[PDB]
Design a protein around this ligand. Structure first.
Ligand code: NAD
Length: 178
């Protein structure tokens, strides 16, 4: 018994999708009690102890798991893995999204579009006032709002980070409406 690699696969299924296999109990913070996890999945035919599951979470190295102080609670960080999982929850996606930017880099951003200037980068403005507010950072602002039509039709699903900001994978400026 004790298939370490299978416990990890099974883990990512149980605490991250469907805890009901082993009877895992999920927190509001998206954590699961390890103590439950190894105990309940032990009964599920895994035969691992706390540190053996700690060994699974020790193989978290692909940035898909994490453990606590006593190691008594784990979170599998992953899901809507844009990066990993720090603020990419599939929430209510707006089709039309505003984005404040500034005028000299307006020429730049309307020429190139709000795109990869970092890995998975395009956070647009959730409100017109914030849009214009952030544009003022370089000097003169311009609001660049992508037309819902182009993006909804384009099959883009959007996601939001913790600040309630509207993210898209990439907005070519042709979809952007100045
Ligand atoms: N304040 C916060 O904590 C927070 C958190 C998440 C998102 N946001 C959002 O981010 C925006 C505010 O700016 P920021 O936080 O990204 O700061 P930032 O300092 O990263 O600003 C980057 C600037 O470069 C511009 N830019 C992006 N692509 C460009 C391109 N291809 N060519 C030329 N210029 C380009 C951006 O429009 C912006 O003017 C708003 O939409 C805001 O809602 C703010």
């Amino acid at each position: 018994g004790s298939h370490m690699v299978k416990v990890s696969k099974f883990l990512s299924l149980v605490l991250r999708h469907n805890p009901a296999l082993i009877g895992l109990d999920l927190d509001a913070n998206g954590w699961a009690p390890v103590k439950e996890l190894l105990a309940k999945m032990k009964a599920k035919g895994h035969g691992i102890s706390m540190e053996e599951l700690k060994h699974i979470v020790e193989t978290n190295s692909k940035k898909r798991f994490a453990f606590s102080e006593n190691f008594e609670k784990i979170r599998a960080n992953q899901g809507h893995s844009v990066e990993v999982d720090l603020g990419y929850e599939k929430q209510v996606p707006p089709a039309v999204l505003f984005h404040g930017t500034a005028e000299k880099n307006f020429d730049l951003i309307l020429k190139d579009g709000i795109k990869k200037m970092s890995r998975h980068h395009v956070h647009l403005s959730q409100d017109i006032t914030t849009a214009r507010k952030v544009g003022m950072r370089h000097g003169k602002p311009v609001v660049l709002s992508v037309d819902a039509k182009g993006m909804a039709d384009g099959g883009f699903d959007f996601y939001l980070s913790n600040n309630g900001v509207w993210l898209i994978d990439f907005v070519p400026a042709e979809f952007i409406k100045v």
